[PDB]
Amino acid sequence: KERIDILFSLAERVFPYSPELAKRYVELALLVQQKAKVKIPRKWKRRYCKKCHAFLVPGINARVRLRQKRMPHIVVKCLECGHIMRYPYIK
Ligand SMILES: [Zn+2]
What family is reported? Predict the structure, then answer.
């Protein structure tokens, strides 16, 4: 409820500050989310790494390269995993 939202705000400030610190904070926010057993729209579900459990934004804990071919593609590397993720896009 409110508890997640406070953690989310805290996770956001740490997030640019240090990906690694944020990684610890997010893992707390996600752990809270399952424990509270509350589903939220896109806020945590769509804004995190698959195994880091860290806030996903390009430029901050993770970086994205945008490629132009006539197939759109972006590649995202998130530091906490240290791994590159592909996200296909069309139009
Ligand atoms: Zn990651």
Answer: Belongs to the eukaryotic/archaeal RNase P protein component 4 family.
54 Cα–ligand 1 center, Å: 7
78 is in an annotated binding site: yes
Residue 81 labeled ligand binder: yes
Type of residue numbered 84: I
What was the structure determination method? NMR
Regarding whether 50 and 26 lie in a shared domain, the answer is: no
- 53 and 26 part of one domain: no
Between the two ends of the chain, the Cα-to-Cα distance in Å is 36
Query: Is there a single domain that holds both residue 2 and residue 30?
Result: yes
* Residue 83 labeled ligand binder: no
Residue 7 among known ligand-binding residues: no
CA distance 34 to 15: 21
